[PDB]
Design a binder for this molecule. Structure first.
Ligand code: SF4
Ligand code: SF4
Lengths: 85, 85
């Protein structure tokens, strides 16, 4: 089961930022954010994902943009940015 | 007159996010978002602010949560998080 502090689907920030815990159901094709084809975009390779968040698991990680919460590594939002060198 | 796409108080996203174009009149103290003293928080030091948005001025700048629109640099909403990276 999801952590209790998972980002909720209809959290107001999640709504505004176009977060979806399943990237395949997200607006990523429409958004056309640069750096990878949309089909390759998800939280796991994002700049803002925080691997060392409290309560992180292989599936659930922090995000700079959702303080105190956990996103799904297979998620996406409109701030997706490939983590660069 | 302000940019045509300045965020209005009756914008539906604004209401959901608890945006106020005057941070001093916002809920920022009670909300106590982490990362800076709440009384110092406003759009100008927020991670979501986009200073190079089309139509921006020294007063009106972009926000990732209000695509296509301009917030006030002195504003605040409950999604505030410190600009960082
Ligand atoms: S900023 Fe990155 S890690 Fe955070 S929810 Fe959006 S895509 Fe996922
Ligand atoms: S997310 Fe940040 S920049 Fe956007 S309205 Fe809220 S406080 Fe202002």
């Amino acid at each position: 089961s999801a952590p209790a502090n998972a980002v909720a689907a209809d959290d107001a920030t999640a709504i505004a930022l176009k977060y979806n815990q399943d990237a395949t159901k997200s607006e990523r094709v429409a958004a056309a954010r640069p750096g990878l084809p949309p089909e390759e975009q998800h939280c796991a390779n994002c700049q803002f994902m925080q691997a060392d968040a409290a309560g992180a698991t292989d599936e659930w990680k922090g995000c700079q943009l959702f303080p105190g919460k956990l996103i799904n590594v297979n998620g996406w939002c409109a701030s997706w940015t490939l983590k660069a060198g």
